[PDB]
Design a protein around this ligand. Structure first.
Ligand code: NA
Length: 121
């Protein structure tokens, strides 16, 4: 049906926009602290602490499968990245502080993404 096609074209375009957002977020992490999953072989107790691990590579995989239906879903995953980090790592660490900085800088990116998504429909 043409209506199905139109809905698929919208999802594709959202996926495009969310790719640009993901690339911008990742540019705010030059150290690549959040680029890849935490090593379950190297913080061996990680999954006792954190029930829903998240990272940018995992988000890129979901995005390439057109797995985000709306901006809220994508934001949820970015917030997991941040929140998991702030729980596991103490306030005095480079890790906790890198999460705070990313949240602050990424909030700007996500605020404009919300205006574009709303505006474009
Ligand atoms: Na903590």
């Amino acid at each position: 049906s043409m209506e199905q096609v139109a809905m698929e074209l919208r999802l594709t375009e959202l996926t495009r926009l969310l790719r640009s957002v993901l690339d911008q977020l990742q540019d705010k992490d030059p150290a690549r602290i959040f680029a890849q999953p935490v090593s379950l072989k190297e913080v061996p107790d990680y999954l006792d602490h954190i029930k829903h691990p998240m990272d940018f590579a995992t988000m890129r995989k979901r995005l390439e499968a057109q797995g985000y239906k709306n901006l809220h879903e994508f934001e949820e995953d970015f917030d997991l990245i941040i929140d998991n980090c702030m729980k596991y790592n103490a306030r005095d660490t480079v890790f906790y502080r890198a999460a705070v900085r990313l949240r602050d800088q990424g909030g700007v990116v996500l605020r404009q993404a919300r205006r574009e998504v709303d505006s474009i429909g």
